[PDB]
Amino acid sequence: PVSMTKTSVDCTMYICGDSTECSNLLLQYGSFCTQLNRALTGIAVEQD
Amino acid sequence: AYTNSFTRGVYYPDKVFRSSVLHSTQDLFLPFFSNVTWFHAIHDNPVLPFNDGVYFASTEKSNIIRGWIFGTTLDSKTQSLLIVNNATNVVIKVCEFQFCNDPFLGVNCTFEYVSFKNLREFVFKNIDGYFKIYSKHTPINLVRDLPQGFSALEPLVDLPIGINITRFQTLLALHAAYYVGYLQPRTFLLKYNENGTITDAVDCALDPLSETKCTLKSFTVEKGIYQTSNFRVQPTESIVRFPNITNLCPFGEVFNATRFASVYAWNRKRISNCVADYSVLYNSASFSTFKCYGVSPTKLNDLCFTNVYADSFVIRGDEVRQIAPGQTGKIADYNYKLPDDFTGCVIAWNSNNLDSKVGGNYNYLYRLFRKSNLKPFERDISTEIYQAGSTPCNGVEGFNCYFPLQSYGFQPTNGVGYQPYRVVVLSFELLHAPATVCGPKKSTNLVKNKCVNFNFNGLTGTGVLTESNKKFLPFQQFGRDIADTTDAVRDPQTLEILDITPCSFGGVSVITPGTNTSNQVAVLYQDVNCTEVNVFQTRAGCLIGAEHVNNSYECDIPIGAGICASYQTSQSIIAYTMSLGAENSVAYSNNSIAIPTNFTISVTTEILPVSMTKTSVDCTMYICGDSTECSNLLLQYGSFCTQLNRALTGIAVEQDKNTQEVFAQVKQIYKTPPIKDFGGFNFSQILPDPSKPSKRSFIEDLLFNKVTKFNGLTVLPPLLTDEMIAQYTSALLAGTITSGWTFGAGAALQIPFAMQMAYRFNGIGVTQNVLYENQKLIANQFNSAIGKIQDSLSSTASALGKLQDVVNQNAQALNTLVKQLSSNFGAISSVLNDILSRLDPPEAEVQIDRLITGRLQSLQTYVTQQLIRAAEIRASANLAATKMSECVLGQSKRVDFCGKGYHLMSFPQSAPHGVVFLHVTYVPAQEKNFTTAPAICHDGKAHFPREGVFVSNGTHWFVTQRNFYEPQIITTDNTFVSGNCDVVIGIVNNTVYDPLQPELDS
Ligand SMILES: *[C@@H]1O[C@H](CO)[C@@H](O)[C@H](O)[C@H]1NC(C)=O
Ligand SMILES: *[C@@H]1O[C@H](CO)[C@@H](O)[C@H](O)[C@H]1NC(C)=O
Ligand SMILES: *[C@@H]1O[C@H](CO)[C@@H](O)[C@H](O)[C@H]1NC(C)=O
Ligand SMILES: *[C@@H]1O[C@H](CO)[C@@H](O)[C@H](O)[C@H]1NC(C)=O
Ligand SMILES: *[C@@H]1O[C@H](CO)[C@@H](O)[C@H](O)[C@H]1NC(C)=O
Ligand SMILES: *[C@@H]1O[C@H](CO)[C@@H](O)[C@H](O)[C@H]1NC(C)=O
Ligand SMILES: *[C@@H]1O[C@H](CO)[C@@H](O)[C@H](O)[C@H]1NC(C)=O
């Protein structure tokens, strides 16, 4: 295997999809969405 | 009259000093380069919407504009402020002043305070009751309109009025040029300088440039692809689909029955074919207590449940808290037990008057004695006499004989907690029965191929509703997927299978070149079909902004599905099928050979992250910095942070081990000779310069120059400082300049650099004779190639990509740790001295525990992230150690392992937490077509070369090495005799000249 499936799983919509209140409570955790999205993006560009 | 609001309107969201740091906040500013209205001051004061604010600017020469009135009615009906400056006093009052018929200044008194060449900007506003006076006076040389320039707008005075303003009217002076920008709750990338003046700002929700600007946290964005947010097709309307129920449900019957059951025999009234509004329930104010455990106490009317139970039984006032999960007592253990996962809602209204006889209500029973505690939602009708003592009864009294059921005497003369009630615990359940009890919300038509807000029988979501062929059985109602989410539903009014699929969604990514190159904007909608959104549709999605090009180019900013975007010609953004290269068919046949007549020595900079900043956090200092209570509460987790400290110190020691394995493979001190008579190969740019104060290379100096805390986490200094890392690199360079591969294995053997290149040439199967034949030429090419390294390494910032990105990666890891010191994690504050200094210790274990589980989980993500990052660094560092061992400390025969081309050697160069290798490679340049045959037959015997390839230019046959055209006549010290000419295909007639033949003939 040279690559996995290039999953681009977004933090806010995966955890609180189609929701504003849950995304507001989730951004109160600080950066976990931005380093998780950067981690998935780094994974995707790593398969590329 | 419209104006481009160029740069004006930036103020301080807060007045906390910051330096060389970019803070992002949500606040009310007007957008940059936006549309603002242009006014004159001849013969205009309409009441504009100050919905959340505007920005004022004045071109003034005689002080005509002098005041403002802001408010919601602005007619002394509400509290409205007036501003006058009578050349000596500043007067800002909201008191009941006499305003004129047309409000001007000449040329509810609760707030108890009673007393061109100039651009004036004033923003009077209210945020949370603060009245901020924002002021700035700025000289200019400009007359046409508002100037282009940056101006921080600072607060001066905060006054206690706290006034609603939704629309405002300017104040004139009778015997006003201004601008109106509608502010929005937008997020803003703000820049502070070291002197504390806000020098720039970005409204970053405006255009793709600014969206990249505040997602990359920088005012200058590199050319590339960046995901900024998510695109979701918003529902345009709401569809409600409920069964065609026509009967009002007897909820009022189980509230207003002539009699209610006891807790000994409470009823299960099961409900189907009903409409439940609950609006009459909430409109009734009779509820004494409403402890609604599974579902919201207020938000229930729109919700639909599958089945409901009315568990009506009468119990005392002090016992109303015992109808709860986890509660115990006589009633909770002997009469009615609720499960710990009870999903429902408990009802009890103020009801002393109805289920209470004036002579005593005697018909309600309860169980006070039982040998075992009862089960959740079971019904026990058993009347067996409870066994208390020792001897049994044959229906008599005495020992072991009381009736286990006895009744309440309900009289109005009882105590206030002992009062009778019509408590009726409507034991709601959310199960997955056929959903019947829905709020009315009259239905609408079934839309197709358009995602809207649907609520099918209490099940909500977003998606399109299409017809399906999915053959339901008549009892079955809902569909599920492999991921057990809802796949199909049946419309409960018309019996049709409705497929549910959420519409096209996805993150938005942005194509943008450098801001130092362009400001042209582009957006990408991936996996969206170009209906629901100079528009291009591809397999990757809907691309808006770039014109589609049938001509194919090399990929610069990747898009997806083979599409790539770039910036070219007059320049513009283009979209195209990306090239896989130049379309170059090879000139194959059975007899076609290509061998290069010319070569070049190319040098490639394989730069490798070998090491990392030895970050080490402290259980005390980082997690619970200078706090005895928090350090104790972290040791409450036991050895947990101790293996974290062990792991981080392990990362430090193995980083030292990586550096030792790549550099201190050398056992001695090697120093360069005072003369650099290196056979034409000047190394004073790659070798340390004695004229330099620190003995490092010149290219290392540009690797130190062009490419380059105290708050609980420290950095450990390396065991190897930068100067003596440079000393080890100088040692490795010296060993591979005067000693080559020998000092890697054993004793230092002095070997010339000409010998190293000549023998390294042999390694890749090209003969070393070419090197001494063109020594001056390749000295020129290699020196100028190192000069091209110097030029590229000094000109392009992208040449340091693989170390700049990793040093930045560690920087963002540390920076996210730093940002968790702002993150609250559910605690009310993020600074630990603040949270400890204001919380009493018993609730401080709770607050500190939330903060440290958040801090420790973020630190856990951090330490695992650098554990896998140090695994990547250590994999690339064992790669670097084998690279140095086989490519510096020896010659590698691994093709394409030491950069593109036939590897010759490599030159270590120290760099900030990394190694730069100067891999010299052999790359062929110019080639010719020749005719070739597998073998040459000479005297009935087939001939094969020991080294090299048979070729012919069409006139004479030659044997030549596979990577350089050196034609010689076929000679038996280059070929050998084998086999016969009758078997091999493609063999040609020739003669093979034995070098022994002229010796024996002469
Ligand atoms: C900020 O303050 C320093 C300190 O006097 C001053 O020298 C400088 O000119 C100011 N302005 C800047 C850095 O733009
Ligand atoms: C109830 O809904 C069904 C939908 O199929 C419809 O055919 C029927 O006429 C409706 N009846 C009333 C009284 O609204
Ligand atoms: C995109 O929408 C058009 C509009 O009708 C349609 O013809 C085309 O099939 C769609 N593309 C895909 C991949 O379904
Ligand atoms: C082959 O091409 C290289 C390219 O620079 C040149 O330096 C060299 O002199 C050429 N050799 C011959 C034999 O033409
Ligand atoms: C050193 O390298 C420079 C290249 O800038 C060259 O001009 C000079 O002749 C070299 N000196 C020696 C002694 O090789
Ligand atoms: C394949 O090789 C044979 C023998 O060298 C030759 O006769 C034949 O023409 C070749 N095929 C082509 C397409 O040239
Ligand atoms: C030359 O090659 C041919 C095959 O094409 C072979 O039959 C013959 O014996 C060879 N030698 C000669 C003609 O001397």
UniProtKB/Swiss-Prot annotation, chain B:
Phenotype when changing residue 284 to L: In strain: Omicron/BA.1
Annotated spans, Receptor-binding domain (RBD): 232-454
Documented effect of changing residue 406 to R: In strain: Omicron/BA.1, Omicron/BA.2, Omicron/BA.2.12.1
Impact upon substituting residue 120 to K: Partial loss of biliverdin affinity
Stated consequence of mutating residue 582 to V: In strain: Beta/B.1.351, Iota/B.1.526
Region (Immunodominant HLA epitope recognized by the CD8+): 361-369
Domain BetaCoV S1-NTD: 1-216
Molecular function via GO: host cell surface receptor binding; identical protein binding; receptor ligand activity; structural constituent of virion
Region (Disordered): 232-248, 368-403, 432-454
Site residues (Cleavage), renumbered to this chain: 696-697
Phenotypic consequence of residue 645 to K: In strain: Omicron/BA.1, Omicron/BA.2, Omicron/BA.2.12.1, Omicron/BA.2.75, Omicron/BA.4, Omicron/BA.5, Omicron/BQ.1.1, Omicron/XBB.1.5, Omicron/EG.5.1
Keywords, alphabetical: Coiled coil, Disulfide bond, Fusion of virus membrane with host endosomal membrane, Fusion of virus membrane with host membrane, Glycoprotein, Host cell membrane, Host membrane, Host-virus interaction, Inhibition of host innate immune response by virus, Inhibition of host tetherin by virus, Lipoprotein, Membrane, Palmitate, Signal, Superantigen, Transmembrane, Transmembrane helix, Viral attachment to host cell, Viral envelope protein, Viral immunoevasion, Viral penetration into host cytoplasm, Virion, Virulence, Virus entry into host cell
Substitution effect: residue 414 to Y: Increased binding affinity to human ACE2
Protein name as it appears in the record: Spike glycoprotein
Underlying gene: S
